[PDB]
C-alpha cells in the first residue's frame, strides 16, 4: 500500500499537537516524551492529545488519526490489530474490531477502511475549545500491544494526525511515535537514557 505523508505541516491555521506532562512513575498509564517525540501507553488506556490552532478553522473541519509503521521496510504494510485482539469482545458499537486506533467518548467518530490503500483511520469533527480552555482534547485508545505477534510484532509505529476540510483535503499535519506496552514509565525512562548515551 502507498505510504501516507508524515511531513509536519502547520498550514493556514497553525495546527499542532500538544501533550500533558504525566511523568514516569509506576502508576502512569500514558506518558509523552518530547525528546523522542514518542507516546508510551498501556493497552486500551485513555491517551489525551491536545489540538492547538492559532486561528479558528471553518465549520466542518475534521481531525483524522492513522497509524503507519515507522521503519522504511515496513511502511507499506497496513497497521492492524493482531489475530487475538481483533477477536476480543471489546467493541464500543462504533469501532470496527480490526482498527488499532479508537477515539474514546465521541459519538460522532467515523471509522474508515480506505477502498484503495486498505488503511484504517478514525475521524471526528473538529470542535472549538470549551469555554474555560485554550485547546481541544481528543482521547485515543490503542487496542494492541507493540509486541503482539501477528500484528505490530515489536515494530514501532507512528500516529499521523491530519486536520482536514469537509472534503478531506489537507489543512494541517502532525505526528508522534507510539509504543503500546505494559510499563510505559519504565520504557520511557529507558529509551530516553539510550538517547542520552
Ligand atoms: C478544531 N476545530 C475548531 Cl473550529 C477549533 C477552534 N477554534 N479548534 C480545533 C482543534 C484544532
Ligand atoms: Zn494484539
Kindly summarize this structure in a few lines.
It is classed as cell cycle. The chain has 197 residues and is mainly β. It is built from 1 helix and 11 strands; from the N terminus they run βββββββββββα.
Give a description of the structure.
This protein has about 200 residues and is mainly beta. It has one domain: Immunoglobulin-like (Sandwich). The protein contains one helix and eleven strands. The protein has a seven-stranded mixed beta sheet. A hairpin with a 6-residue loop joins strand 7 and strand 8. It starts with 15 loop residues before the first strand and ends with a helix. The structure holds 3,5-bis(chloranyl)-6-ethyl-pyrazine-2-carbonitrile (A1II1) and zinc ion. The site of zinc ion has 8 residues, from loops.
What is the number of independent domains? 1
Side-by-side strand order of the widest sheet: 2-3-11-10-5-8-7
Give the distinct bound molecules.
3,5-bis(chloranyl)-6-ethyl-pyrazine-2-carbonitrile, zinc ion
CATH architecture: Sandwich
Q: Note the quaternary state here.
A: monomer
The 3D shape can be described as globular
> What's the count of strands?
11
CATH class: Mainly Beta
Question: Largest sheet, described in full?
Answer: 7 strands, mixed
Distance between the termini: 36 Å
Radius of gyration: 16 Å
Helix content: under 10%
How many alpha or pi helices? 1
Cross-link (Glycyl lysine isopeptide (Lys-Gly) (interchain with G-Cter in ubiquitin)): 197
Site (Interaction with DNA): 26
Region (Interaction with HIPK1): 6-197
Modified residues (N6-acetyllysine): 26
